[PDB]
C-alpha cells in the first residue's frame, strides 16, 4: 500500500551511496594523457550485394567473414578480404531486425519482426544451409540475438524480456524480466558470464547468464538507448541513445563515468563498439556518418562519412584490423 | 587469383545473379501496410479481399501483400520505419464505435500520428470507414454530438457519414504530396478490392510518371 515510498527511500539510498564513492571526474584523471591526435579511416572495400535497407551485421571470430541481414529477405555471408559472398541464405520472414554469428562459425542466427530468432546451419553436408531451429516463445519482436556457444543463445525481444535459449531442445531455459519498455540492444561479455540489455526505459541493467537476476541498473539517459557494447576489459560498457549522448558506464563503480556529446550533433545513436584496445569509441549516428570518440577524454578524434543514409550496424573485428558500418543504402563499408 | 579463388568468385557471381533475379521478382509485388485501431474491423476487410501476419492476394494481374502489424504490442516508433517505401497504408476505421469508449477519438489520434509521420510523408493513405450498416441504424438512438460537440447539421446517415469522412480527411497537414482515398465498405460486394486496385494503380501511375521525369 505504502511500499513504493520504501522503494523511493531505497532508490535515494542507492543514489547517495553511488554519489558518495565519486571523486575522480575521470576527465580530471585523463587530463595529463596525450590525445590520439586525428585518425583518418578510408573505405578499403564496399560490400555491394543487398537491394534494400540492412539493419544488422556481425563479424566472425576468424575476423574474415561477416554476415549482414537485410529487408530484401536475405542475409548473405561476405568474405571481407576478397568482397566475395560465400552464402546467400533466403530467409522466410523478410522483416529482419538483428543478426548474430556463432563464435566457432558453424551457425548464424536470424530473427526479426515475427517473434522467432531462427538460427541457420552453415558447416553441414548436402551443400546449402538449413534452418537448424526456429526458437519461438517471445511476444514482442527480436531486437538482438547473440551466441554464447553452438548450443546457447540469449535474445532481447520487444516484450520487455531477455531470454536465454537452448538450441538442442529449443526452449527458454532462463527468462530475464526486469525492464518496463522494449529491449533495443544487448551485448555479451569477453568471458560470456554476464551481459547487459539496452532498453526503451533509458536504463541499462547488468544481468547474470547463470542465476537470472539483474545485479545492477544504470540510469542517467533521457530517451531510448539503441546500442550497447562492453569495454574489452569487461568492466565498462558504452550506451548509444536518442539524446545524441554515448555514455561510458562502469560495472565496478556502479555509476556513469563520462558522456560523449557535441552541441552540433542532434541525431540518435544506432550502434556503438570500442576498438581492440578500448581507446577510440565508434558511434553510428543518423547524420549518415559514424563519429570516432576518444573514449578517455570525450573529444572527437575522426569522422567516417561515406554513407548516403543512416547507419544501422557497426562491427569491430576481433583483432581491431578494421571496422564495418552498414547504412540503409544496401552498402556496408569496411573502413581501416 | 588461384585455382580455387576463381571458382569462389564464379560462385559469388552466380549467387549475385540469383540475388538480382529474386530482387527483380520480389520488387514486382505491391506492398500494403494495414494500420487500424484494435477491433476496427481489420478481420472483415482482410477476409473480404482473399507476430506479423502477411496475406498475399492477386487482382487484375497485380500481386498485393498486406502486413497487418496490429497483432503486436510494442513501441510503434521503434519498428514503424521498417515499413517506409510501402505503396499505400490501408487504415480501416470502425464507424459504428463513435459512441463506444471516445474510441473514434483514439482512431483519429492514431490516424494523425501515422499520416504526419517522417517516413510516410510521401506514401498515400487508403482509409476504410467500415461497419456502415451498424452506424446507419445506430444514429436513430445516439446523435453524433456524443463524439463531436462542434457538429452542426442534420441527424441523417448520408450527412453524418460525409461529416466523419471530411473530419478524418482534414488530419493530414501535407495535402499536396500524399492523397487520402476513402471508401464506405460494401459488405456483400467485391468493390472493396476494386477500390484498393484503383487507389494502388493511381498512386503507381503518379509514382511512375514522377519516375519518368515528366509527372
Amino acid at each position: 500500500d505504502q511500499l513504493r515510498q520504501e522503494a523511493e527511500q531505497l532508490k535515494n539510498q542507492i543514489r547517495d551511496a553511488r554519489k558518495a564513492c565519486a571523486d575522480a571526474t575521470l576527465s580530471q584523471i585523463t587530463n595529463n594523457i596525450d590525445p590520439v591526435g586525428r585518425i583518418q579511416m578510408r573505405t578499403r572495400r564496399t560490400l555491394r550485394g543487398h537491394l534494400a535497407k540492412i539493419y544488422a551485421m556481425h563479424w566472425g571470430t576468424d575476423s574474415r567473414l561477416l554476415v549482414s541481414a537485410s529487408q530484401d529477405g536475405k542475409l548473405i555471408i561476405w568474405d571481407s578480404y576478397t568482397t566475395n559472398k560465400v552464402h546467400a541464405i533466403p530467409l522466410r520472414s523478410s522483416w529482419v531486425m538483428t543478426c548474430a554469428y556463432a563464435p566457432s562459425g558453424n551457425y548464424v542466427a536470424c530473427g526479426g519482426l515475427d517473434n522467432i530468432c531462427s538460427i541457420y546451419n552453415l558447416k553441414t553436408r548436402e551443400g546449402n544451409v538449413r534452418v537448424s531451429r526456429e526458437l519461438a516463445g517471445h511476444t514482442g519482436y527480436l531486437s538482438c540475438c547473440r551466441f554464447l556457444d553452438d548450443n546457447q543463445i540469449v535474445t532481447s525481444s520487444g516484450d520487455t524480456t531477455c531470454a536465454l535459449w537452448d538450441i538442442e531442445t529449443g526452449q527458454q531455459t532462463t527468462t530475464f524480466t526486469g525492464h518496463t519498455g522494449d529491449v533495443m540492444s544487448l551485448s555479451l561479455a569477453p568471458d560470456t558470464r554476464l551481459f547487459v540489455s539496452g532498453a526503451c526505459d533509458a536504463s541499462a541493467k547488468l544481468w547474470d547468464v547463470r542465476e537470472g537476476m539483474c545485479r545492477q541498473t544504470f540510469t542517467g539517459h533521457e530517451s531510448d538507448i539503441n546500442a550497447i557494447c562492453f569495454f574489452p576489459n569487461g568492466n565498462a560498457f558504452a550506451t548509444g541513445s536518442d539524446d545524441a549522448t554515448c555514455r561510458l558506464f562502469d560495472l565496478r563503480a556502479d555509476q556513469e563515468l563520462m558522456t560523449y556529446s557535441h552541441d552540433n550533433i542532434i541525431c540518435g545513436i544506432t550502434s556503438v563498439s570500442f576498438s581492440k584496445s578500448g581507446r577510440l569509441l565508434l558511434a553510428g549516428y543518423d547524420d549518415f556518418n559514424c563519429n570516432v570518440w576518444d573514449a578517455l577524454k570525450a573529444d572527437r578524434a575522426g569522422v567516417l562519412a561515406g554513407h548516403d543514409n543512416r547507419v544501422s550496424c557497426l562491427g569491430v573485428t576481433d583483432d581491431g584490423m578494421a571496422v564495418a558500418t552498414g547504412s540503409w543504402d544496401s552498402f556496408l563499408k569496411i573502413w581501416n | 587469383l588461384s585455382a580455387e579463388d576463381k571458382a569462389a568468385v564464379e560462385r559469388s557471381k552466380m549467387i549475385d545473379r540469383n540475388l538480382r533475379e529474386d530482387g527483380e521478382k520480389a520488387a514486382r509485388e505491391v506492398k500494403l501496410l494495414l494500420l487500424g485501431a484494435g477491433e476496427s474491423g481489420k478481420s472483415t476487410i482482410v477476409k473480404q479481399m482473399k507476430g506479423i501476419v502477411e496475406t498475399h492476394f492477386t487482382f487484375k494481374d497485380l500481386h498485393f501483400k498486406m502486413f497487418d502489424v496490429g497483432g503486436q504490442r510494442s513501441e510503434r516508433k521503434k519498428w514503424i520505419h521498417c515499413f517506409e517505401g510501402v505503396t499505400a497504408i490501408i487504415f480501416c476505421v470502425a464507424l459504428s464505435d463513435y459512441d463506444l469508449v471516445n474510441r473514434m477519438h483514439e482512431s483519429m489520434k492514431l490516424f494523425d500520428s501515422i499520416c504526419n509521420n517522417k517516413w510516410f510523408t510521401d506514401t498515400s493513405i487508403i482509409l476504410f470507414l467500415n461497419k456502415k450498416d451498424l452506424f446507419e441504424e445506430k444514429i436513430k438512438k445516439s446523435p453524433l454530438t456524443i463524439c463531436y460537440p462542434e457538429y452542426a447539421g442534420s441527424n441523417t446517415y448520408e450527412e453524418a457519414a460525409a461529416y466523419i469522412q471530411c473530419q478524418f480527411e482534414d488530419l493530414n497537414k501535407r495535402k499536396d504530396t500524399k492523397e487520402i482515398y476513402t471508401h464506405f465498405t460494401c459488405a456483400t460486394d467485391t468493390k472493396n478490392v476494386q477500390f484498393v486496385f484503383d487507389a494502388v494503380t493511381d498512386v503507381i501511375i503518379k509514382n511512375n510518371l514522377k519516375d519518368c521525369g515528366l509527372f
Partner: single-chain antibody
Amino acid sequence: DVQLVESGGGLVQPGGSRKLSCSASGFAFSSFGMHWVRQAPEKGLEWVAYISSGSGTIYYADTVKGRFTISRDDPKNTLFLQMTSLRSEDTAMYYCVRSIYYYGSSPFDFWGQGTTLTVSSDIVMTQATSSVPVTPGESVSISCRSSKSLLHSNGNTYLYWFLQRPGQSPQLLIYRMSNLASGVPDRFSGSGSGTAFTLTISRLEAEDVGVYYCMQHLEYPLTFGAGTKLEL
C-alpha cells in the same frame, strides 16, 4: 545420405563411343563443381575433366582434350561424360567426385563408386616412396615432394591427401595440407612447406591400410601422386 553412382561401363571396341552418367542423389547438386577422375587398372588416379556450378567453366586433361565432352543436367541431378574415339589407354574406373569452392570449403570430399570401362608445363607430384610395411599401434610418416611452390600469395598450400582402401573409392583425408576433412579421425595431421609435404598418421591401427595419393590444386590439370601403399 550423399550418394554418387555411375553407369555406362562394360567393354567397348577401340575408336568407338560411349556416355558415362553419374546420377547424384541426397545433396544440392545444382551448386557443386563436379569433376571426373579415372584410375588405370593398376596405377594411381588421373584427372580427366571438370564442370563448374551452372556449367559456366569447363576444363579437360591434355590427354583427353577435344576427344571427350562433359555436360551436367541440373533438374535431373545427373553428370554426363560423352567420350568419342576411345584409345587403348582409356581402360579404367571413372570416379565422379563433387567439389564445392568457397572460403574454408572441403572440395573432393565425396567420391562416386566408379564404373570399370574396358576397351579391346604442369606440376609433377613425385610421391617418391611407393611401398612401406607397418604394424598396428605405431606411427608412419608419408612424404610427397612437389615440383613447384604450392604456397600461393593467399597463404594456402593447395595440396590434398586421399586414402584409397582395398576395393573402395578414395576419400579426402586433409585439404590445404593442414585442415582435417569432415568425419575423419584426429590421427591424421599434415605439415611441411612449399615443394615439400608430409602426412604424419599417429597411433596407426587396422582398417587404415591402403594407398595415399597427394594431389596439387594450384593449377589445372590436377596431377595426383604415384601413391604410397601401406602394407600391413
